[PDB]
CSV table of C-alpha atoms in Angstrom, one decimal:
chain,number,residue,atom,x,y,z
A,1,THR,CA,108.8,-130.4,144.5
A,2,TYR,CA,107.5,-127.7,146.9
A,3,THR,CA,104.7,-128.1,149.6
A,4,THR,CA,101.6,-126.2,150.5
A,5,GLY,CA,99.6,-125.8,153.7
A,6,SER,CA,99.1,-123.8,157.1
A,7,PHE,CA,101.7,-123.5,159.8
A,8,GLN,CA,102.5,-122.3,163.2
A,9,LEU,CA,105.2,-120.2,164.2
A,10,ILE,CA,106.6,-119.6,167.5
A,11,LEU,CA,109.3,-116.9,168.3
A,12,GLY,CA,111.5,-116.4,171.4
A,13,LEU,CA,113.9,-114.0,172.4
A,14,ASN,CA,116.2,-114.9,175.3
A,15,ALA,CA,113.7,-117.7,176.3
A,16,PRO,CA,115.2,-121.2,176.1
A,17,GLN,CA,112.0,-123.1,176.4
A,18,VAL,CA,110.9,-122.3,172.8
A,19,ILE,CA,113.1,-124.8,171.4
A,20,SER,CA,111.0,-127.4,173.1
A,21,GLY,CA,107.9,-126.1,171.0
A,22,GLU,CA,105.7,-125.6,174.0
A,23,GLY,CA,106.5,-121.9,174.6
A,24,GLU,CA,103.5,-119.7,175.9
A,25,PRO,CA,103.3,-116.1,175.0
A,26,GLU,CA,104.7,-113.7,177.3
A,27,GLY,CA,106.3,-110.3,177.7
A,28,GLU,CA,106.0,-107.5,175.5
A,29,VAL,CA,106.1,-108.1,171.8
A,30,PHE,CA,109.5,-107.9,169.7
A,31,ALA,CA,108.6,-108.7,165.8
A,32,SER,CA,105.8,-108.1,163.4
A,33,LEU,CA,104.7,-108.8,159.8
A,34,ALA,CA,106.8,-107.2,157.3
A,35,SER,CA,104.3,-107.2,154.5
A,36,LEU,CA,102.3,-104.6,156.4
A,37,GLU,CA,104.9,-102.0,155.8
A,38,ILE,CA,103.8,-101.6,151.9
A,39,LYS,CA,101.2,-102.0,149.4
A,40,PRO,CA,98.9,-104.9,148.9
A,41,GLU,CA,99.0,-107.1,145.8
A,42,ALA,CA,96.3,-106.9,143.2
A,43,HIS,CA,94.3,-109.8,141.8
A,44,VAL,CA,92.3,-109.2,138.6
A,45,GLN,CA,90.1,-111.5,136.7
A,46,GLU,CA,87.9,-111.1,133.7
A,47,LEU,CA,85.0,-113.3,132.3
A,48,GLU,CA,82.6,-113.3,129.3
A,49,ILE,CA,79.2,-114.0,130.3
A,50,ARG,CA,75.9,-114.5,128.2
A,51,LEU,CA,72.3,-114.0,129.3
A,52,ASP,CA,70.0,-116.4,127.4
A,53,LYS,CA,66.3,-116.2,127.3
A,54,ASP,CA,66.0,-118.9,129.9
A,55,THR,CA,69.1,-117.8,131.7
A,56,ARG,CA,68.5,-114.2,132.6
A,57,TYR,CA,69.9,-114.5,136.3
A,58,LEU,CA,73.5,-115.3,136.9
A,59,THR,CA,75.4,-115.4,140.3
A,60,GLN,CA,79.1,-116.1,141.0
A,61,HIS,CA,80.9,-116.7,144.5
A,62,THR,CA,84.2,-115.1,145.5
A,63,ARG,CA,87.1,-116.3,147.5
A,64,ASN,CA,87.1,-115.0,151.1
A,65,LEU,CA,88.3,-111.4,152.1
A,66,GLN,CA,90.4,-110.5,154.9
A,67,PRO,CA,89.5,-107.5,156.8
A,68,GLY,CA,90.5,-104.2,155.5
A,69,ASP,CA,90.5,-105.4,151.7
A,70,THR,CA,88.6,-103.6,149.0
A,71,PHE,CA,86.6,-104.9,146.1
A,72,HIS,CA,85.7,-103.5,142.9
A,73,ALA,CA,83.6,-104.7,139.7
A,74,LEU,CA,82.3,-103.3,136.4
A,75,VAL,CA,80.4,-104.7,133.4
A,76,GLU,CA,80.5,-103.6,129.9
A,77,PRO,CA,78.5,-105.0,127.0
A,78,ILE,CA,80.0,-106.6,124.0
A,79,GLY,CA,77.7,-104.6,121.5
A,80,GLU,CA,74.2,-103.0,121.4
A,81,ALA,CA,72.9,-105.1,124.4
A,82,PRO,CA,70.9,-103.3,127.1
A,83,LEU,CA,72.8,-102.8,130.3
A,84,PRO,CA,71.9,-105.0,133.1
A,85,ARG,CA,71.5,-104.6,136.7
A,86,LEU,CA,74.3,-105.1,139.0
A,87,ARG,CA,74.3,-105.9,143.2
A,88,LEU,CA,76.7,-107.4,145.9
A,89,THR,CA,75.4,-109.7,148.4
A,90,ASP,CA,77.0,-112.2,151.0
A,91,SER,CA,76.6,-115.7,151.3
A,92,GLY,CA,73.0,-115.7,152.8
A,93,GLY,CA,71.9,-112.9,150.3
A,94,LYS,CA,72.0,-109.8,152.6
A,95,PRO,CA,72.6,-107.0,150.3
A,96,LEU,CA,75.8,-104.8,150.7
A,97,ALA,CA,76.1,-102.6,147.7
A,98,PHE,CA,74.5,-101.7,144.4
A,99,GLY,CA,75.6,-100.9,141.0
A,100,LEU,CA,75.9,-97.1,139.8
A,101,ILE,CA,75.7,-96.1,136.3
A,102,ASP,CA,78.5,-93.8,135.2
A,103,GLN,CA,77.6,-90.5,133.3
A,104,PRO,CA,78.9,-91.9,130.0
A,105,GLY,CA,76.2,-94.5,130.5
A,106,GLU,CA,78.0,-97.3,128.8
A,107,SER,CA,79.0,-99.3,132.1
A,108,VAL,CA,77.8,-100.1,135.8
A,109,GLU,CA,80.4,-100.2,138.6
A,110,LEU,CA,80.5,-101.5,142.2
A,111,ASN,CA,82.5,-101.1,145.2
A,112,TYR,CA,82.7,-102.4,148.6
A,113,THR,CA,85.1,-102.5,151.8
A,114,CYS,CA,85.8,-105.2,154.4
A,115,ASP,CA,84.7,-105.1,157.9
A,116,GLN,CA,83.9,-108.3,159.3
A,117,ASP,CA,87.0,-111.0,160.0
A,118,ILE,CA,85.9,-113.2,157.2
A,119,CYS,CA,83.5,-111.8,154.4
A,120,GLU,CA,82.2,-114.4,151.5
A,121,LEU,CA,80.8,-112.2,148.7
A,122,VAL,CA,78.3,-113.2,145.8
A,123,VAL,CA,78.0,-111.0,142.6
A,124,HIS,CA,74.6,-110.6,141.0
A,125,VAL,CA,74.1,-109.7,137.4
A,126,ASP,CA,70.6,-109.8,135.9
A,127,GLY,CA,68.6,-108.4,133.0
A,128,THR,CA,65.2,-109.5,133.9
A,129,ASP,CA,63.8,-106.0,133.5
A,130,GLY,CA,61.0,-107.5,131.8
A,131,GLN,CA,59.9,-110.6,129.7
A,132,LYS,CA,61.6,-109.5,126.3
A,133,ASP,CA,63.3,-112.4,124.6
A,134,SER,CA,66.5,-110.3,123.2
A,135,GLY,CA,68.2,-113.4,122.5
A,136,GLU,CA,71.9,-113.9,122.6
A,137,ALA,CA,72.9,-110.6,124.6
A,138,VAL,CA,76.8,-110.9,125.9
A,139,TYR,CA,78.5,-108.8,128.4
A,140,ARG,CA,82.0,-108.2,129.6
A,141,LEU,CA,82.5,-108.6,133.4
A,142,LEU,CA,85.8,-107.3,134.9
A,143,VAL,CA,86.6,-107.7,138.8
A,144,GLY,CA,89.5,-107.5,140.9
A,145,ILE,CA,90.7,-107.4,144.7
A,146,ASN,CA,92.8,-104.5,145.8
A,147,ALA,CA,92.8,-103.2,142.3
A,148,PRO,CA,91.1,-99.7,142.2
A,149,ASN,CA,92.6,-99.2,138.8
A,150,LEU,CA,90.3,-101.8,137.2
A,151,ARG,CA,89.1,-98.9,134.6
A,152,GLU,CA,92.5,-99.1,132.9
A,153,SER,CA,94.1,-102.4,134.1
A,154,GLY,CA,96.8,-102.3,131.3
A,155,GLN,CA,98.1,-105.8,132.8
A,156,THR,CA,96.9,-109.0,131.8
A,157,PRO,CA,95.0,-110.6,134.5
A,158,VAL,CA,97.3,-111.2,137.4
A,159,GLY,CA,97.6,-113.1,141.0
A,160,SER,CA,95.1,-115.9,141.7
B,1,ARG,CA,70.7,-101.5,185.5
B,2,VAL,CA,69.9,-104.4,183.2
B,3,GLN,CA,66.6,-105.6,182.0
B,4,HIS,CA,65.4,-108.6,179.9
B,5,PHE,CA,62.7,-108.8,177.5
B,6,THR,CA,61.3,-111.7,175.3
B,7,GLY,CA,58.7,-111.6,172.2
B,8,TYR,CA,57.4,-112.6,168.9
B,9,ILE,CA,57.6,-110.7,165.5
B,10,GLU,CA,54.8,-111.6,162.9
B,11,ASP,CA,55.3,-110.2,159.2
B,12,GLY,CA,57.0,-107.0,160.4
B,13,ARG,CA,54.7,-106.0,163.2
B,14,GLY,CA,57.0,-104.2,165.7
B,15,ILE,CA,56.8,-104.1,169.5
B,16,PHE,CA,57.0,-100.8,171.4
B,17,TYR,CA,58.7,-100.2,174.8
B,18,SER,CA,58.4,-97.2,177.1
B,19,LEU,CA,61.6,-95.7,178.8
B,20,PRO,CA,59.7,-93.0,181.3
B,21,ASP,CA,61.4,-90.1,182.3
B,22,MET,CA,65.1,-90.5,181.2
B,23,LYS,CA,67.4,-87.7,182.5
B,24,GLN,CA,70.0,-85.7,180.2
B,25,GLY,CA,73.4,-87.3,180.2
B,26,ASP,CA,72.1,-90.9,180.6
B,27,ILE,CA,73.6,-93.7,178.1
B,28,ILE,CA,71.2,-96.2,176.6
B,29,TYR,CA,72.5,-99.5,175.4
B,30,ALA,CA,70.4,-102.1,173.5
B,31,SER,CA,71.0,-105.3,172.2
B,32,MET,CA,68.7,-107.7,170.0
B,33,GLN,CA,69.5,-111.5,169.1
B,34,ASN,CA,67.7,-114.0,167.2
B,35,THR,CA,66.2,-117.2,169.0
B,36,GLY,CA,64.2,-119.0,166.6
B,37,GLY,CA,63.1,-118.7,163.1
B,38,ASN,CA,64.5,-116.2,160.2
B,39,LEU,CA,64.2,-113.1,162.2
B,40,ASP,CA,66.8,-110.2,161.1
B,41,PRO,CA,66.7,-107.8,164.1
B,42,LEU,CA,66.4,-103.8,164.1
B,43,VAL,CA,66.2,-101.3,166.8
B,44,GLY,CA,65.7,-97.9,167.0
B,45,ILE,CA,64.9,-95.2,169.4
B,46,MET,CA,62.4,-92.2,169.2
B,47,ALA,CA,60.6,-89.5,171.4
B,48,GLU,CA,57.1,-89.5,170.1
B,49,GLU,CA,55.6,-93.0,169.5
B,50,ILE,CA,54.4,-93.4,165.8
B,51,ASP,CA,54.0,-96.6,164.2
B,52,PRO,CA,56.6,-97.0,161.5
B,53,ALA,CA,54.7,-99.5,159.2
B,54,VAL,CA,53.2,-97.1,156.9
B,55,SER,CA,56.5,-95.2,156.3
B,56,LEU,CA,58.4,-98.8,155.9
B,57,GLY,CA,55.9,-100.1,153.8
B,58,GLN,CA,56.8,-97.5,151.0
B,59,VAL,CA,60.3,-98.8,151.0
B,60,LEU,CA,59.0,-102.5,150.0
B,61,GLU,CA,56.4,-100.9,147.5
B,62,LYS,CA,59.6,-99.3,145.6
B,63,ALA,CA,61.9,-102.0,145.6
B,64,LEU,CA,59.4,-104.4,144.7
B,65,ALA,CA,59.0,-102.4,141.4
B,66,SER,CA,62.3,-101.4,140.3
B,67,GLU,CA,66.1,-101.3,141.2
B,68,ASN,CA,65.6,-98.6,143.9
B,69,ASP,CA,68.6,-99.7,145.7
B,70,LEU,CA,66.9,-100.9,149.0
B,71,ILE,CA,70.1,-100.1,151.3
B,72,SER,CA,70.0,-96.5,150.2
B,73,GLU,CA,66.0,-96.1,150.4
B,74,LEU,CA,66.1,-97.8,154.1
B,75,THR,CA,68.9,-95.6,155.6
B,76,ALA,CA,67.1,-92.3,154.3
B,77,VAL,CA,64.0,-93.4,155.9
B,78,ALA,CA,65.3,-94.6,159.2
B,79,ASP,CA,67.3,-91.5,159.4
B,80,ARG,CA,64.0,-89.7,159.5
B,81,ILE,CA,61.8,-91.9,161.5
B,82,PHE,CA,64.5,-92.8,164.1
B,83,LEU,CA,67.0,-90.5,166.3
B,84,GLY,CA,69.2,-93.6,166.2
B,85,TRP,CA,69.1,-97.1,165.0
B,86,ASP,CA,71.4,-100.3,164.2
B,87,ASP,CA,70.9,-103.1,161.8
B,88,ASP,CA,73.9,-105.7,162.0
B,89,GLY,CA,76.3,-104.1,164.6
B,90,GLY,CA,76.3,-107.3,166.8
B,91,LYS,CA,77.4,-111.0,166.1
B,92,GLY,CA,75.9,-111.9,162.6
B,93,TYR,CA,72.8,-109.9,161.7
B,94,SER,CA,72.0,-109.2,165.6
B,95,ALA,CA,71.8,-105.3,166.5
B,96,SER,CA,73.5,-103.2,168.9
B,97,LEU,CA,73.0,-99.7,169.7
B,98,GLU,CA,74.6,-96.6,171.9
B,99,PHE,CA,72.5,-93.5,172.6
B,100,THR,CA,73.3,-90.7,174.6
B,101,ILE,CA,70.0,-89.2,176.0
B,102,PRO,CA,69.9,-85.8,174.4
B,103,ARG,CA,67.6,-83.9,177.0
B,104,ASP,CA,65.2,-84.5,179.8
B,105,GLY,CA,62.1,-86.4,179.3
B,106,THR,CA,60.6,-89.8,178.2
B,107,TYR,CA,61.5,-91.8,174.8
B,108,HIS,CA,60.4,-95.1,173.1
B,109,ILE,CA,62.3,-98.0,171.8
B,110,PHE,CA,61.2,-99.8,168.7
B,111,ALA,CA,62.2,-103.5,168.0
B,112,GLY,CA,61.2,-105.2,164.8
B,113,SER,CA,62.4,-106.6,161.4
B,114,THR,CA,64.4,-105.0,158.6
B,115,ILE,CA,64.1,-105.3,154.9
B,116,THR,CA,66.4,-108.2,153.9
B,117,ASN,CA,66.8,-110.7,150.8
B,118,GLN,CA,67.2,-114.3,151.7
B,119,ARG,CA,67.5,-115.8,148.3
B,120,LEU,CA,70.3,-116.4,145.3
B,121,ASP,CA,68.0,-117.6,142.5
B,122,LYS,CA,66.0,-114.3,142.4
B,123,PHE,CA,66.2,-110.9,144.4
B,124,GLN,CA,62.8,-110.4,146.6
B,125,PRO,CA,62.9,-108.1,149.7
């Protein structure tokens, strides 16, 4: 089988002490990450959620985001269910973004960009506008990382 | 030129500090860190001393009743009340501010609490 885990890599140029495994950084750099030369890989996931009478508030946790990344989300009801509210907060609850209703008012969308070294995000979906017992309202939630084309994804959910 | 201050904030009641007779061309620096409790620092600078409580209260009045998007309404009110401000520019929720003194005169520094949510079961600023 294959193996998984974290690693430390030390590279040297005309520095015979590297093969000992104890080479301290010195001189001027000579190698760089190759993946930075091209475009990032998109990850998309879609889930179906239902807001019952006693379960009108729902939250979900997202994986860690590296600096420079982007985050998008949108919600579309299955049928005649009213549009719920959408917002984005961190793990402590500090607000970061709020949902915008499009001119064709059938969906709500959100967007964010990463600034800190590590960002942990939480997505809030709530339909507790009042106290009406609408019943079995069901919505479709689409989320993506580094996927600005979530409006027309086309491909099935890719990546992790 | 560095000076230290320590204080306590109760239910969003800020503290004013006076900067007498600054000169044009000076650069002000500010940093505010939490040392106890759940305080979320906020710092702002202005010329004429006016209590922001009446203006900031309307932001809590609107959010408490609707969607209103706090992060929008707070930025718009702050850009009117203060000449310069910062919420989370430091390590964590701490604030840090750089402000070039526009003209010659005196100014005021305002320290206090921002409007935030700290729950995941329901939204309550």
